[PDB]
Scaffold this active site. Structure first.
Site, PDB file in Angstrom:
ATOM      1  N   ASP A   1      39.353  43.875  40.833  1.00  0.00           N
ATOM      2  CA  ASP A   1      39.471  42.592  40.499  1.00  0.00           C
ATOM      3  C   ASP A   1      38.175  42.051  39.987  1.00  0.00           C
ATOM      4  OD1 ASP A   1      39.976  40.090  39.914  1.00  0.00           O
ATOM      5  OD2 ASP A   1      40.790  39.654  42.120  1.00  0.00           O
ATOM      6  N   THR A   2      37.946  42.071  38.561  1.00  0.00           N
ATOM      7  CA  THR A   2      36.667  41.518  38.010  1.00  0.00           C
ATOM      8  C   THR A   2      36.480  39.979  38.235  1.00  0.00           C
ATOM      9  OG1 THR A   2      37.786  41.352  35.981  1.00  0.00           O
ATOM     10  CG2 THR A   2      36.605  43.098  36.276  1.00  0.00           C
ATOM     11  N   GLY A   3      37.757  39.268  38.407  1.00  0.00           N
ATOM     12  CA  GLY A   3      37.455  37.732  38.722  1.00  0.00           C
ATOM     13  C   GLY A   3      37.306  37.561  40.300  1.00  0.00           C
TER      14      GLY A   3
END
Ligand SMILES: CC(C)(C)NC(=O)[C@@H]1C[C@@H]2CCCC[C@@H]2CN1C[C@@H](O)[C@H](Cc1ccccc1)NC(=O)[C@H](CC(N)=O)NC(=O)c1ccc2ccccc2n1
Ligand SMILES: [Cl-]
Ligand SMILES: [Cl-]
Ligand SMILES: [Cl-]
Ligand SMILES: [Cl-]
Ligand code: NA
Ligand code: NA
Ligand code: NA
Lengths: 99, 99
Positions: free
Chosen positions: B25-27
């Site tokens: 999850d890059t967010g």
């Protein structure tokens, strides 16, 4: 371009003719933009995250530019704290996770 | 290795001696795992996202394996609906976002 993840992956987007900042988010199924005036028909939807779900406006077939790439797809508008570009539009701009 | 985003980027992890599935999850700033017994010292924290905040137990210096890659860092344990690998560990396993 290739982005490391030492900082939040924030990019410039254009939506409704307005420039804004948003997070490239591989963990988000959908694209959620902060409350704004956006022309177009919409319908109510709930969307979930940690903390539970929020009620948003679902707009289909919205033209959006993401870091210079044009995309068309569904955008959710509602009281998110941060503008999020999720997989429904990351796939259209050809983004991948590499490692 | 390259992961396209037509489906959720789920990988197998090993934490506390147990296999689990988790989202790359890059967010997410932080790594958040579902309730589990995890040995070690911890301290309480609250973390926020789309539907508000959850309370978690913050464990530092946890040994974790993510899709075959070793990492050591902070893991938050609490009532997330999905296990999340966030940027604090994605930088260790060498993930980048390519578009
Ligand atoms: C995990 C934590 C460290 C809290 N970080 C965050 O949550 C930050 C918060 C930031 C500020 C608020 C706006 C969102 C951004 C990005 N996020 C990460 C961000 O990637 C976040 C991670 C996540 C994934 C799955 C479930 C929960 C949480 N995704 C989401 O919030 C998106 C929003 C959406 N509908 O597309 N949720 C999901 O795509 C999603 C998928 C499955 C689910 C199953 C049940 C319950 C909820 C579910 N939510
Ligand atoms: Cl819908
Ligand atoms: Cl132009
Ligand atoms: Cl357990
Ligand atoms: Cl113990
Ligand atoms: Na730009
Ligand atoms: Na510590
Ligand atoms: Na691209």
């Amino acid at each position: 371009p290739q982005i490391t993840l030492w900082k939040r992956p924030l990019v410039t987007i254009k939506i409704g003719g307005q420039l804004k900042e948003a997070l490239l988010d591989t963990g988000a199924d959908d694209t959620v933009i902060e409350e704004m005036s956006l022309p177009g028909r919409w319908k109510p939807k709930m969307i979930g995250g940690i903390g539970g779900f929020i009620k948003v406006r679902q707009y289909d077939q919205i033209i959006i530019e993401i870091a210079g790439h044009k995309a068309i797809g569904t955008v959710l508008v509602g009281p998110t704290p941060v503008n999020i570009i999720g997989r429904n539009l990351l796939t259209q701009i050809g983004a991948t996770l590499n490692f």
